[PDB]
Design a protein around this ligand. Sequence first.
Ligand code: NA
Ligand code: NA
Ligand code: NA
Lengths: 30, 30, 30
Amino acid sequence: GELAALKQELAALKWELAALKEELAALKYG
Amino acid sequence: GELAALKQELAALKWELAALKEELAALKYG
Amino acid sequence: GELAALKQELAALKWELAALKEELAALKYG
Ligand code: NA
Ligand code: NA
Ligand code: NA
């Protein structure tokens, strides 16, 4: 499961990056 | 295969992280 | 070697995203 674990971590990091972008947009415009 | 796909995803995530940093910095300095 | 390098990059990106979360919280507070 070594590659599968890295794939799951990358998917989580991609979700966290999207959430940070949404938080920055809220700060910029809100 | 799987390792090539993970390498490509990591490269894209690093590019989008740099883009987020630049936007955040621009907001902070502005 | 490539798997080890990708694991190291993903671990670093976790810390980078946490630091960006802290910067966004500071912008919220400022
Ligand atoms: Na085994
Ligand atoms: Na999603
Ligand atoms: Na902090």
